[PDB]
Amino acid sequence: CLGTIGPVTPLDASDFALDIRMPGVTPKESDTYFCMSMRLPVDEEAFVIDFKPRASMDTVHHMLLFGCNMPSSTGSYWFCDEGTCTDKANILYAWARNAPPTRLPKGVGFRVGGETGSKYFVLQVHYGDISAFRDNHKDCSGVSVHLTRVPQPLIAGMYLMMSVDTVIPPGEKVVNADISCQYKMYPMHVFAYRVHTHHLGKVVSGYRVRNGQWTLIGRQNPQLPQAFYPVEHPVDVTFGDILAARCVFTGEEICNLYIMYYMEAKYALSFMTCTKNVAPDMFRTIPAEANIPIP
Numbered sequence: 001c002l003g004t005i006g007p008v009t010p011l012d013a014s015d016f017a018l019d020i021r022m023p024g025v026t027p028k029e030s031d032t033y034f035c036m037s038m039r040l041p042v043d044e045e046a047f048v049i050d051f052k053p054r055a056s057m058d059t060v061h062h063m064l065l066f067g068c069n070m071p072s073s074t075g076s077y078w079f080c081d082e083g084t085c086t087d088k089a090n091i092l093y094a095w096a097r098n099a100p101p102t103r104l105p106k107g108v109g110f111r112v113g114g115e116t117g118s119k120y121f122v123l124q125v126h127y128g129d130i131s132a133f134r135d136n137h138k139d140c141s142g143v144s145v146h147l148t149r150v151p152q153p154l155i156a157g158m159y160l161m162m163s164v165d166t167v168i169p170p171g172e173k174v175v176n177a178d179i180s181c182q183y184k185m186y187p188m189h190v191f192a193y194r195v196h197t198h199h200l201g202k203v204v205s206g207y208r209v210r211n212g213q214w215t216l217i218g219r220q221n222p223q224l225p226q227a228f229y230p231v232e233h234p235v236d237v238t239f240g241d242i243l244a245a246r247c248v249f250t251g252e253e254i255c256n257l258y259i260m261y262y263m264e265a266k267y268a269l270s271f272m273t274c275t276k277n278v279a280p281d282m283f284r285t286i287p288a289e290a291n292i293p294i295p
């Protein structure tokens with residue numbers, strides 16, 4: 001794993017690869033999350049245009065890569081339940097064993113560095129079940145990243161919808177957490193999504209609503225591989241639209257929908273969020289499919 005090629009590998013006059021890999025780490029308990037950081041080598045703005053997972057296709061179940069400015073630690077590596085970043089950890093990439101890859105569409109890149117872009121990458125690697133006879137070989141799992149200083153026409157970002165707090169009342173088998181915001185920027189084109197709960201989430205769905213008509217962004221059971229699922233055909237969201245989501249919870253709290261989009265570079269923002277339910281009555285009209293469980 002260790003056996004080396006430099007952290008930075010120039011590719012042509014304006015592109016370089018960044019190899020982001022665990023520094024020969026040895027998981028000891030099943031189910032461990034290890035984190036590392038890597039500063040961008042350039043101070044000027046640059047664009048992330050591709051990723052390649054380099055996962056121990058023995059023990060690694062999951063990887064996440066975040067962009068942020070303040071990694072939770074300055075150590076060679078650390079344990080993620082002490083944090084990923086102290087500031088907002090902007091998710092850029094997810095990999096899970098046996099999930100579909102989700103690729104950056106051509107002409108799309110995440111904008112990093114420069115004035116307002118992320119200064120660091122933070123890698124999180126989830127090691128699952130190990131054995132107690134493991135020879136303490138080292139693991140250097142991670143991700144290789146393709147960066148260019150060539151301006152991309154389309155800039156990728158994340159629209160994070162979060163529920164802020166419903167409670168699961170006593171005597172409840174089903175609870176809906178609803179989230180909705182108006183959209184008032186230049187168009188975004190949603191091309192992947194990821195859902196996240198901890199309370200036994202049943203199904204999480206996100207929609208664009210335009211003139212009262214709902215268009216599915218994506219729906220998934222939150223209990224399975226939390227990578228990014230591709231949107232069958234990218235959904236454009238424009239000024240006047242409402243983003244809406246419903247998390248369906250069972251008795252026997254947090255619901256996040258991460259919506260990965262691109263925007264025209266001239267008009268792009270790298271992140272947006274909704275933590276409100278501005279149009280709660282609209283949910284009376286929500287498609288029935290939003291309440292159908294995904295076992």
Ligand SMILES: [Cu+2]
Binds near residue numbers: 061062063
């Ligand atoms: Cu995992």
Ligand SMILES: [Cu+2]
Binds near residue numbers: 198254
């Ligand atoms: Cu969580």
Ligand SMILES: [Cu+2]
Binds near residue numbers: 198200
């Ligand atoms: Cu709960």
Ligand SMILES: [Cu+2]
Binds near residue numbers: 232233
């Ligand atoms: Cu089709």
